[PDB]
Amino acid sequence: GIGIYSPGIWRIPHLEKFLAQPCQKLSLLRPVPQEVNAIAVWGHRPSAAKPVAIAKAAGKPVIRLEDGFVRSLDLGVNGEPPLSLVVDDCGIYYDASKPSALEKLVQDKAGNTALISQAREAMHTIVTGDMSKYNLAPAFVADTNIVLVVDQTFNDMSVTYGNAGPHEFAAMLEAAMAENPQAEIWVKVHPDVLEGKKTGYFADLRATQRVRLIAENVSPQSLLRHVSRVYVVTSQYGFEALLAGKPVTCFGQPWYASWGLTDDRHPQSALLSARRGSATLEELFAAAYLRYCRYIDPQTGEVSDLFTVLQWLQLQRRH
Ligand SMILES: Nc1ccn([C@@H]2O[C@H](COP(=O)(O)O)[C@@H](O)[C@H]2O)c(=O)n1
Ligand SMILES: [Cl-]
């Protein structure tokens, strides 16, 4: 079956329902058993490197896991288990350097066309139901040329493997201010940073003149309703802004950039766009949320689907 080296992965409740194959615990100090057909690791976490090297030396395929795009109520850093995982047998969605399984699913346009009705339905529920990767934050309350600038957690692997770093956050903020000289600039702090368990790229930024720091945990769709445009490096927020109908400028190379839907500023955007080609928003959504992500039922733990997870999350949110 699938070999697992990381105790953290092994402890994910209902892991075998996400992987849809039996899983077995392996030792880094013993040969890979013959019955193991693939090895699973978590993204590019440092713990992945040695299992990946073993897999390659043993001729076994590598599967990289990560959290789903609609994951849970509370944050991962707070211990809440995931209701959704991505399962990538090629790379990982946030690594722009080569195709990922997600990239290939987006490029399979016929497969995505078959899911247009499901995609439209789920997109509508996510936007109008105010859902996101995490789902405990209250709705934002406003009181209007507003430009949203999205911070991330320092050294997020989606930044590093998306060909970005501190420089792109500085360039992004400078561009937002220079390109919108009369707007209010809202810098949104990431919730893991608000929880105190991480630091953000704008940690040293002084709230100043036209720049307001949004240091509150609020649901993205509710906040996006009040902004005119969104600047990101690689945050999932950028895709959520596309769902909300807002223009998105991208300074890194996230999974949703370079398809023709974003104002891409990264110096390699032309090269990534040549590899990816074009895709529509509904194609990207179907590939990412309906084909790439896998779900369990929040009440039974059995294999499930996005619609059931959305239905349950909106239950919990009505309070
Ligand atoms: N500045 C930010 C960055 C992320 N987020 C939340 O964190 C989720 C994951 O975003 P990242 O990809 O930036 O980690 C988003 O879907 C959103 O719910 C936020 O609310 N404010
Ligand atoms: Cl790992």
Side-chain angles (χ1 to χ4, degrees), residues 168-225:
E168 284 65 47
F169 287 82
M172 171 176 63
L173 178 61
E174 166 177 305
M177 294 176 69
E179 293 167 11
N180 310 273
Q182 222 149 94
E184 274 234 299
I185 313 300
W186 289 2
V187 178
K188 176 58 174 59
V189 179
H190 192 287
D192 294 357
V193 178
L194 298 176
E195 204 78 359
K197 297 172 179 177
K198 294 193 157 58
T199 296
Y201 286 91
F202 297 118
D204 300 317
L205 184 63
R206 183 172 47 97
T208 289
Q209 294 297 76
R210 308 187 289 116
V211 178
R212 176 180 167 190
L213 190 62
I214 312 304
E216 12 170 336
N217 186 29
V218 295
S219 53
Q221 293 298 331
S222 74
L223 179 54
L224 289 162
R225 292 187 69 176

Side-chain angles (χ1 to χ4, degrees), residues 132-134 150-152 156 158 188-191 217-218 220 234-237 240:
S132 185
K133 189 177 181 186
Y134 316 107
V150 178
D151 206 355
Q152 288 173 250
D156 181 351
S158 86
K188 176 58 174 59
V189 179
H190 192 287
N217 186 29
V218 295
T234 61
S235 178
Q236 182 54 15
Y237 225 117
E240 300 178 284

Side-chain angles (χ1 to χ4, degrees), residues 6 9 41-42 45 47-48:
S6 165
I9 298 176
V41 302
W42 192 270
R45 268 176 92 86
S47 52

